[PDB]
Design an enzyme around this catalytic site. Structure first.
Site, mmCIF file in Angstrom:
data_model
loop_
_atom_site.group_PDB
_atom_site.id
_atom_site.type_symbol
_atom_site.label_atom_id
_atom_site.label_comp_id
_atom_site.label_asym_id
_atom_site.label_seq_id
_atom_site.Cartn_x
_atom_site.Cartn_y
_atom_site.Cartn_z
ATOM 1 C CG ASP I 42 17.679 5.904 -0.866
ATOM 2 O OD1 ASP I 42 17.208 6.644 0.009
ATOM 3 O OD2 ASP I 42 17.318 4.720 -1.018
HETATM 4 P P1 ZMP Z 1 16.176 6.155 -5.479
HETATM 5 O O1 ZMP Z 1 16.630 6.775 -6.771
HETATM 6 O O2 ZMP Z 1 17.207 5.279 -4.840
HETATM 7 O O3 ZMP Z 1 14.948 5.189 -5.828
HETATM 8 C C1 ZMP Z 1 15.221 3.792 -6.112
HETATM 9 C C2 ZMP Z 1 14.255 3.252 -7.154
HETATM 10 C C3 ZMP Z 1 12.919 2.915 -6.501
HETATM 11 C C4 ZMP Z 1 14.018 4.325 -8.201
HETATM 12 C C5 ZMP Z 1 14.872 2.031 -7.833
HETATM 13 O O4 ZMP Z 1 16.141 2.409 -8.314
HETATM 14 C C6 ZMP Z 1 14.129 1.197 -8.872
HETATM 15 O O5 ZMP Z 1 13.795 1.685 -9.945
HETATM 16 N N1 ZMP Z 1 13.874 -0.064 -8.553
HETATM 17 C C7 ZMP Z 1 13.179 -1.013 -9.404
HETATM 18 C C8 ZMP Z 1 11.787 -0.575 -9.726
HETATM 19 C C9 ZMP Z 1 10.887 -0.677 -8.523
HETATM 20 O O6 ZMP Z 1 11.233 -0.229 -7.455
HETATM 21 N N2 ZMP Z 1 9.704 -1.255 -8.657
HETATM 22 C C10 ZMP Z 1 8.779 -1.381 -7.553
HETATM 23 C C11 ZMP Z 1 8.149 -0.058 -7.261
HETATM 24 S S1 ZMP Z 1 6.434 -0.125 -6.706
HETATM 25 C C12 ZMP Z 1 6.614 -1.246 -5.389
HETATM 26 O O7 ZMP Z 1 6.741 -2.423 -5.577
HETATM 27 C C13 ZMP Z 1 6.080 -0.719 -4.116
HETATM 28 C C14 ZMP Z 1 4.616 -0.784 -4.145
HETATM 29 C C15 ZMP Z 1 4.039 -1.029 -2.778
HETATM 30 C C16 ZMP Z 1 3.216 0.092 -2.253
HETATM 31 C C17 ZMP Z 1 1.980 0.329 -3.045
HETATM 32 C C18 ZMP Z 1 1.240 1.542 -2.602
HETATM 33 C C19 ZMP Z 1 -0.232 1.369 -2.509
HETATM 34 C C20 ZMP Z 1 -0.787 1.736 -1.184
HETATM 35 C C21 ZMP Z 1 -1.563 3.000 -1.230
HETATM 36 C C22 ZMP Z 1 -2.348 3.250 -0.008
HETATM 37 C C23 ZMP Z 1 -2.876 4.626 0.049
HETATM 38 C C24 ZMP Z 1 -3.678 4.785 1.284
HETATM 39 C C25 ZMP Z 1 -3.075 3.950 2.375
#
Ligand code: ZMP
Ligand code: CDL
Ligand code: CDL
Ligand code: PC1
Ligand code: PLX
Ligand code: PEE
Ligand code: PEE
Ligand code: PEE
Ligand code: PEE
Ligand code: 3PE
Lengths: 52, 99, 459, 54, 128, 69, 178, 174, 87
Positions: I42
């Site tokens: 993916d």
């Molecule tokens: P591929 O096309 O399969 O991708 C799948 C995706 C992700 C595009 C999905 O189809 C999708 O759109 N899903 C629903 C939307 C979604 O995923 N929302 C959540 C995304 S953000 C999430 O919740 C993760 C955040 C957690 C991590 C945060 C990062 C911050 C930490 C930074 C630290 C830097 C120094 C350590």
């Protein structure tokens, strides 16, 4: 080859002049925004974002 | 159009007709001799000859004369115990102050 | 002085009688010969001047200025023949005639022994300069620039004529020697204040003083290359020479009247350097740099000490050479890309290496880099100002920092970075342009080798 | 650059002087060429010269 | 939660932290499309002239021409004497001059007073 | 595998520097040789008291042979 | 760089860019490879946890909170590849990049020092001159009447043509020119 | 060396201690001095002998210009341009000679500082007082004349000094 | 200084990395395989693959370009074009 019509002019006071200024500066009419007419000589030159 | 006007001419490149051009003239011979006279006269004559002439200009500013005069004055004054620099430029006897 | 004056008036008929393709060659060669002959004037005396006759005399202040004028004429011929290729023969000869007339007027100006003959010649220099600007300038604004230049100078100089004739009626003579030997103190009165104002304001406008300087960017930007070269290198120095000469009769009133002019000069030095920092045009940047340096020279003359006059003379000669060279470099760039904007042509170091070297050397001299005569003059002025007061050092240091900033900004912007991609007509530098830069820069370093030749009469 | 050089130093000496001279030129030269008007002016001048000059 | 970021004029707001980036309207999408169309039109014009085998010289930039004109030659025609302009001009053009006049006048008056009173160290001060 | 290095033309800068060196050394080298020969063979004058009843000239008041000339 | 951008970034594109940036900054914090592998797997666990989410409003809010968390926890001095825009070797060889138009101003003696190179260069110049009209015609045939809606360029549709506007892309200076 | 006058430019007698080595190790400084004398000093001395032989065949002399005294600005009548000119030139020449005298005293001071080295504060007290006196007199004469200095201005300065001294003497004797 | 890259060397290195990926079966992996159409990965897997290639070859692939490389051959062509490799 720039014509006299493609130069900065005075502050626009009518929406037609604002549209003409926006078209001259290759900008959307919605995005175009002059400096405030405080008599500092900016004219109709656009006020673009102050980034780098 | 408001006039019968010539179009703006294209810029002329001197290296197209004359690859080994100095940029002085369109004619190759005139260009070469213009370069030659400029380089010769300016650099050789003016630079070298004027620099050496100015270097060896006679000491008409009297630097070395003033130094020798100062040495004579210092020798005489320190031999006789006089102050090396006189306190007054002019003679107070010659000067007549108001009452 | 006739052995130098007559060969110029003979350059005139030679120019009009030579063939159509030999005008540049003849004019250049014989200008160089006249410059060599004028080099003999540097053998000055320690006590008094060279009193050739009743009409002309030479001094340690006049001689370097004459040498600079005579040396500047052939360089102007080279730059002119660069930019005047397609002209007709008659108009080429008219341009050379204007240059020769300007040189003749300047020679007689620096060697004139009367204030009235000096006035006549120093006002006569206006006509050839105005004709050159308003006729052979490129853009529309040459006409307005000529109007500004002419009317600023005349508004400054007409009260000078009134004051000069008044002084002749009062004292019987305008001869410089007589007014030096028979000088009397100028009492503090309104009449004396306005006499002082007439004289000093004439030369301050010619300098220019900050606030009376707009004509300078207008004319120096809009003039052709020879006009720019003579406007900055020599014509700005008529003000300094006149102010040095005429302040013999203005004491002790100069002690009290110099405060407004010193304040204007110091603050405007700062202001014009700061302007140079943010200029979108290269020629305007060089013009405002000229204004800053002349502000420093004005400070030197007004504080009026033996150390300040030597610094003023050195700075005037050095600025003449350096500004002429900078104008020539900018003009070569303009003849490539036909625009004066500074950010249009970049990467000129990777397109033209030797011109990058010339730019580096000219900008290193523009800022005071030791032991160049630019630095020698600036440092003598700074030391005299320090003796005058101890905050002049603050203003002078700020000015030096800003000068270095804008000089290196100009160098980095034009020469460094990456070349503009769509400018595909940057042909290799010509031998003529390279020789022009070399002839500008070598005399400056030789003058560094022998510095007593440009330190003036007070040395 | 803007406020002082391009705006206020330009307004004080050269712009104001030029504007004043242009206005006075318009005032002087704006005449209808009427002999009645400028002969009445002559009469006023003659009376002023006779009275206020002694 | 996490400490918030305060944008300044010299440390601007990141695009990822801009609240408007996560509130997108259908008119926002068409505004973006119009902006991209303008950029594409300009890019096509520039690239055609740029890749022209017969072009020799500088591709004139009207935007650059307008910028240089607006920065110098269009300022005075669009200048009006307002209270703000007059006060700023008077301050920035007169205040420094009189401040420096006062500073230097006071310093030189103190120096000359000490000279007259004969208690200023002037020994070895030969060069002036 | 050597690759062609695209560079601007150095012919014209090289030619200018070569001409400039030639024309400075065209007169400078003879001047240096002449100065050395004069200095080695026609030395500098030595200071002397003016003989009584003798009136010198300005060149006789100067020291170096080239300056006197 | 090589690809024309679109009018906007989709939600998936934003999420993937955040994923890559977060992993790079996590690697900058976690210097050692084993520690980086551990915490990278945890980060992917968080992304996979929110992977399936039908409510796009909730998805956008999650992305916004993740961006705020990243900005708070980002490395002040993240690792940058030397040739990348923030890197130490960025733009070092730009002063060595010279164009072929600069090449054709050479003196005849200079050009005589490379006889075989300039024959091929003349062939390339002829190829460029023989195709310009077809390129401009193809560009003006395929554009919409309004104008280009994007910066993408078409390929050559015929067996004798070349992709329009190709010269500077093909003849760009080498990455290590001198 | 007879090049300069030892009275004008004095130097103390040079006391150089004799070497008193206490080691069997050879002295690298002595070996290198011997090498320097063999390779450099001998060729340069031969070259100078040749040049000085060539000079002695072309011996010629130059003289020091002598200026006689002329009446000064005090004796010159008012607006008598010729006497004023001669007096002004004479005053200018005397100003130059005084400047060079100050230069000589400064050279003495600098040389003594360097020569004495770590005990210069005590050993150069004679040169410091001489420089103080010469500089004070020079300053009182030509201190604040300006860029356009002249014999008339210096005469006015001296008259002012004489008036001030006379007033101070009268007040003291009061 | 460093030996020049070759198309075969770039191909070998990219396939080496991909065979060291656990979610890819090394037996059915070829230079024309699609990461999602015939390998079943993916978008996050593709992001990690591109980052692994960035670490392998020591340079960065911008997100605008990296989102399109769906094939080892596409990665090879991209890297060869960026590094001026023609052999
Ligand atoms: P591929 O096309 O399969 O991708 C799948 C995706 C992700 C595009 C999905 O189809 C999708 O759109 N899903 C629903 C939307 C979604 O995923 N929302 C959540 C995304 S953000 C999430 O919740 C993760 C955040 C957690 C991590 C945060 C990062 C911050 C930490 C930074 C630290 C830097 C120094 C350590
Ligand atoms: C002696 C040399 C000169 C010295 C000058 C010094 C001052 C003297 C003043 C009086 C001079 C005399 C009068 C000359 C008039 C000439 C008119 C003319 O047609 O000129 C072109 C003419 C040749 O062209 P042409 O075939 O007639 O074709 C003309 C067409 O128009 C060609 O077609 P075109 O379209 O190409 O031409 C157009 C052109 C045609 O326009 C012209 O030709 C007009 C020229 C200017 C008009 C005359 C002005 C006179 C007033 C005094 C000021 C003059 C200064 C400039 C002098 C220019 C001299 C040519 O007009 C323009 O381009 C417009 C330009 C506008 C700006 C410039 C013009 C004004 C300049 C002057 C103002 C500045 C003055 C400053 C103040 C100081 C003054 C000293 O030139 C000459 O004939 C040269 C004259 C001199 C010959 C040599 C004489 C000496 C011989 C040897 C003597 C040796 C002595 C012994 C030595 C010891 C050893 C033996
Ligand atoms: C020397 C002339 C310097 C200026 C012109 C440079 C021309 C040039 O392009 O040279 C590069 C060029 C080398 O070829 P290239 O590398 O292919 O050139 C391509 C690029 O231009 C290559 O460009 P580039 O980047 O390689 O350029 C190298 C160089 C090119 O630029 C320069 O060389 C400029 C240097 C001056 C900078 C500006 C002035 C700064 C203030 C100092 C002013 C006074 C200096 C001393 C007095 C000088 C008197 C002449 O620039 C620098 O290295 C930067 C220097 C930065 C300043 C250094 C620190 C300040 C000075 C500190 C010491 C001051 C002295 C007193 C010390 C007190 C204690 C003893 O030079 C030549 O080919 C030389 C041949 C032509 C000239 C000589 C002709 C032969 C005759 C020689 C003897 C003449 C006398 C008669 C003897 C008879 C027997
Ligand atoms: C080819 C390279 C080498 C030669 C180069 C060209 C000549 C170089 C300079 C002269 C060399 C020596 C000649 C000596 C002549 C006098 C002999 C004598 O007894 O003199 C005693 C006198 C003694 O000095 P005096 O002042 O007491 O003399 C009294 C007056 N007379 C001369 C009548 C006796 O010394 C001289 O005359 C010294 C002259 C020095 C040189 C003068 C400048 C050069 C003049 C020529 C033009 C410039 C050439 C520069 C170099 C080339 C440039 C392209
Ligand atoms: C590849 C190159 C590498 C860089 C090399 C250059 C950088 C090194 C520079 C440092 C070395 C300098 C060499 C110094 C050699 C000694 C010669 C020099 O010292 O003499 C000078 C001589 O002065 C020079 O001639 C300067 C002349 C100034 C230029 C004159 C004008 C030239 C015409 C051009 C007109 C320009 C007019 C501009 C306005 C005036 C100084 O005076 P002086 O040493 O004691 O003279 C000795 C002769 N005495 C003993 C009889 C007195
Ligand atoms: C509007 C207000 C204008 C103010 C600025 C002045 C400029 C307009 C000029 C109008 C004249 C100004 C008055 C000049 C003073 C005057 O006339 O007398 C001065 C004095 C008195 O003479 P006596 O009659 O003999 O007195 C003996 C007493 N027993 O005469 C002199 O000393 C000669 C002075 C010449 C007058 C010079 C005029 C002064 C103007 C200053 C010059 C500044 C202008 C420079 C322009 C710069 C801008 C480019
Ligand atoms: C008080 C009694 C009179 C004393 C005279 C004082 C000095 C007079 C200054 C002489 C110059 C001014 C003359 C009149 C100028 C004028 O008419 O102003 C309008 C004038 C009209 O020009 P046109 O060619 O007709 O083109 C149409 C443009 N709309 O506008 C301009 O463009 C002129 C701009 C430049 C004028 C000259 C520049 C210098 C002006 C004064 C500078 C010196 C002042 C001292 C500082
Ligand atoms: C150490 C100093 C010694 C130097 C002495 C130098 C004396 C002159 C030597 C250089 C002169 C150069 C030319 C010498 C002979 C000419 C050679 C020749 O035949 O070529 C001519 C060269 O012609 C020229 O270029 C003209 C330049 C030669 C004449 C200019 C030199 C005259 C200078 C006189 C000097 C006297 C000045 C002394 C008084 C000082 C005055 C202030 C033909 O070329 P073109 O005419 O351009 O071809 C086109 C024809 N279809
Ligand atoms: C420490 C640096 C101080 C610099 C020098 C000190 C001077 C005082 C500081 C500035 C005061 C005014 C100087 C000139 C500034 C002009 C004001 C201005 O630019 O705005 C004018 C407003 O001015 C006016 O029209 C009315 C004239 C007077 C109002 C402003 C001056 C009031 C100053 C307050 C006096 C000091 C208060 C004392 C408080 C205690 C201090 C010890 C126009 O308003 P806007 O249309 O909004 O344009 C601004 C765009 N953002
Ligand atoms: C709208 C109007 C805008 C006007 C702008 C004016 C700008 C400011 C110019 C002057 C700036 C510094 C002022 C310094 C000053 O006030 O000096 C006073 C000076 C000394 O007098 P005082 O202290 O009384 O001495 C008695 C003995 N203790 O007194 C004197 O020296 C006597 C008077 C000298 C000055 C006479 C006039 C000349 C003014 C300067 C030049 C003007 C032209 C250039 C200025 C810019 C013009 C655009």
């Amino acid at each position: 080859h720039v014509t006299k019509d493609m130069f900065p002019g005075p502050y626009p006071k009518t929406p037609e002049e604002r549209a003409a200024a926006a078209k001259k500066y290759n900008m959307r009419v919605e995005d175009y925004e002059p400096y405030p007419d405080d008599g500092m000589g900016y004219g109709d030159y656009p006020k673009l974002p102050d980034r780098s | 159009i408001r006039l019968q006007e010539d179009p703006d001419p294209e810029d002329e490149n001197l290296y197209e007709k004359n690859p080994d051009s100095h940029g002085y003239d369109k004619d190759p011979i005139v260009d070469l001799w213009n370069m030659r006279v400029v380089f010769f006269f300016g650099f050789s004559i003016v630079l070298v000859l004027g620099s050496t002439f100015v270097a060896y200009l006679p000491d008409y500013r009297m630097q070395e004369w003033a130094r020798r005069e100062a040495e004579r004055l210092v020798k005489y004054r320190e031999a006789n115990g006089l102050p090396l620099m006189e306190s007054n430029c002019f003679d107070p006897n010659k000067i007549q102050l108001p009452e | 002085m006739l052995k130098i004056i007559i060969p110029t008036t003979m350059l005139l008929p030679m120019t009009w009688m030579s063939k159509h393709n030999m005008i540049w060659i003849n004019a250049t060669v014989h200008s160089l010969l006249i410059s060599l002959i004028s080099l003999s004037l540097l053998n000055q005396l320690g006590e008094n001047s060279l009193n050739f006759s009743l009409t002309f005399f030479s001094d340690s202040l006049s001689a370097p200025l004459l040498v600079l004028t005579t040396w500047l004429l052939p360089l102007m011929l080279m730059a002119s023949q660069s930019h005047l290729s397609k002209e007709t023969t008659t108009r080429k000869k008219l341009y050379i005639t204007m240059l020769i007339l300007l040189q003749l007027f300047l020679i007689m100006t620096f060697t004139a022994t009367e204030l009235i003959l000096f006035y006549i010649l120093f006002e006569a220099t206006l006509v050839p300069t105005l004709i050159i600007i308003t006729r052979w300038g490129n853009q529309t604004e040459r006409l307005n620039a000529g109007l500004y230049f002419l009317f600023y100078t005349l508004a400054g100089s007409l009260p000078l004529l009134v004051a000069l004739v008044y002084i002749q009626n009062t004292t019987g003579s305008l001869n410089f020697l007589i007014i030096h030997y028979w000088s009397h103190p100028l009492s503090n009165s309104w009449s004396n204040i306005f006499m002082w104002l007439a004289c000093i304001m004439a030369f301050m406008v010619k300098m220019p003083l900050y606030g009376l300087h707009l004509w300078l960017p207008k004319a120096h930007v809009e003039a052709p290359i020879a006009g720019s070269m003579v406007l900055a290198a020599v014509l700005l120095k008529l003000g300094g020479y006149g102010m040095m000469r005429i302040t013999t009769i203005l004491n002790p009133l100069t002690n009290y009247m110099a405060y407004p002019f010193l304040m204007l000069s110091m603050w405007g030095m700062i202001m014009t350097s700061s302007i140079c920092l943010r200029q979108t045009d290269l020629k305007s940047l060089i013009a405002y740099s000229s204004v800053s340096h002349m502000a420093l020279v004005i400070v030197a003359i007004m504080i009026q000490t033996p150390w300040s006059f030597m610094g003023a003379t050195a700075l005037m000669i050095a600025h003449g050479l350096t500004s002429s060279m900078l104008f020539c470099l900018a003009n070569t760039n303009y003849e490539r890309v036909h625009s004066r904007t500074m950010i249009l042509a970049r990467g000129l170091q990777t397109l033209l290496p030797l011109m990058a070297t010339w730019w580096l050397v000219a900008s290193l001299t523009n800022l005071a880099l030791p032991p160049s005569i630019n630095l020698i003059g600036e440092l003598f002025i700074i030391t005299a100002s320090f003796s005058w007061s101890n905050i002049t050092i603050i203003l002078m240091g700020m000015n030096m920092m800003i000068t270095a900033l804008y000089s290196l900004y100009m160098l980095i912007t034009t020469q460094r970075g990456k070349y503009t991609h769509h400018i595909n007509n940057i042909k290799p530098s010509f031998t003529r342009e390279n020789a022009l830069m070399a002839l500008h820069i070598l005399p400056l370093l030789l003058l560094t080798l022998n510095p007593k030749m440009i330190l003036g009469p007070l040395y | 650059s803007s406020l002082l050089d391009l705006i206020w130093l330009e307004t004080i000496l050269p712009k104001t002087t030029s504007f004043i001279q242009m206005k006075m030129s318009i005032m002087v030269s704006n005449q209808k060429g009427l002999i009645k008007l400028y002969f009445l002016s002559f009469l006023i001048t003659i009376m002023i010269s006779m009275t206020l000059f002694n | 939660s996490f400490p918030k970021y305060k944008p300044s004029r010299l440390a601007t707001l990141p695009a990822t932290l801009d609240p408007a980036e996560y509130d997108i309207s259908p008119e926002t999408r068409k505004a973006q499309a119009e902006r991209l169309a303008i950029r594409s039109r300009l890019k096509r014009e520039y690239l055609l002239q740029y890749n022209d085998p017969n072009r020799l010289g500088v591709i004139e930039d009207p935007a650059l021409i307008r910028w240089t004109y607006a920065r110098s030659a269009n300022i005075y025609p669009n200048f009006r004497p307002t209270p703000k302009t007059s006060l700023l001009g008077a301050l920035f053009g007169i205040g420094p001059l009189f401040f420096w006049y006062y500073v230097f006048k006071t310093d030189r008056d103190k120096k000359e007073k000490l000279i007259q009173e004969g208690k200023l160290d002037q020994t070895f001060n030969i060069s002036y | 595998k050597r690759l062609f290095i695209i560079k601007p033309s150095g012919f014209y800068d090289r030619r200018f520097l070569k001409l400039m060196r030639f024309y400075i050394l065209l007169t400078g080298i003879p001047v240096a040789i002449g100065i050395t020969l004069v200095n080695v063979f026609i030395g500098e004058a030595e200071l002397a008291d003016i003989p009584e009843g003798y009136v010198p000239e300005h060149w006789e008041y100067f020291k170096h042979p080239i300056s006197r000339w | 760089a090589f690809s024309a951008p679109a009018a906007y970034l989709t939600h998936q594109q934003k999420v993937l860019r955040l994923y890559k940036r977060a992993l790079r900054h996590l690697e900058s914090w976690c210097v050692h490879r084993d520690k980086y592998r551990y915490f990278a797997c945890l980060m992917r666990a968080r992304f996979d946890e929110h992977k399936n989410e039908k409510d796009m409003v909730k998805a956008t809010q999650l992305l916004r909170q993740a961006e705020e968390e990243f900005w708070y926890g980002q490395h002040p001095q993240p690792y940058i590849f030397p040739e990348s825009p923030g890197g130490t070797s960025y733009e070092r060889y730009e002063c060595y990049k010279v164009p072929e138009w600069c090449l054709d101003d050479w003196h005849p003696s200079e050009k005589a020092m490379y006889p075989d190179y300039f024959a091929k260069r003349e062939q390339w110049k002829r190829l460029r001159r023989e195709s310009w009209e077809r390129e401009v015609k193809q560009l003006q045939e395929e554009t919409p009447p309004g104008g280009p809606r994007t910066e993408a360029l078409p390929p050559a549709r015929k067996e004798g043509d070349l992709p329009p506007l190709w010269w500077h892309i093909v003849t760009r200076p080498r990455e290590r020119p001198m | 060396p007879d090049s300069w006058d030892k009275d004008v430019y004095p130097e103390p007698p040079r006391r150089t201690p004799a070497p008193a080595p206490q080691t069997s190790l050879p002295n690298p400084v002595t070996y290198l001095t011997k090498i320097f004398d063999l390779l450099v000093d001998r060729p340069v001395t031969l070259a100078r002998e040749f040049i000085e032989q060539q000079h002695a065949k072309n011996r010629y002399y130059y003289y020091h210009r002598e200026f006689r005294r002329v009446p000064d600005i005090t004796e010159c009548e008012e607006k008598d341009i010729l006497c004023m000119f001669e007096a002004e030139m004479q005053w200018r020449r005397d100003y130059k000679v005084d400047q060079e005298i100050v230069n000589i005293i400064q050279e003495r001071l600098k040389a003594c500082q360097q020569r004495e080295g770590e005990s210069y504060r005590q050993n150069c007290a004679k040169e410091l007082e001489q420089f103080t006196q010469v500089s004070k007199a020079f300053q009182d004469r030509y201190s604040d004349l300006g860029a356009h200095y002249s014999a008339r201005k210096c005469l006015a300065k001296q008259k002012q000094r004489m008036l001030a001294e006379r007033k101070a003497a009268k007040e003291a004797a009061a | 200084d460093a030996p020049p890259l070759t198309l075969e060397a770039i191909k070998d290195r990219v396939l080496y990395v991909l065979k060291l990926y656990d979610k890819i079966d090394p037996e059915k992996l070829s230079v024309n395989s699609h990461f999602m159409k015939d390998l079943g990965l993916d978008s996050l897997d593709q992001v990690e693959i591109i980052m692994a290639m960035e670490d392998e070859f020591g340079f960065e692939i911008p997100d605008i370009d990296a989102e399109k490389l769906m094939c080892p051959q596409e990665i090879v062509d991209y890297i060869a074009d960026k590094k001026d490799v023609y052999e």
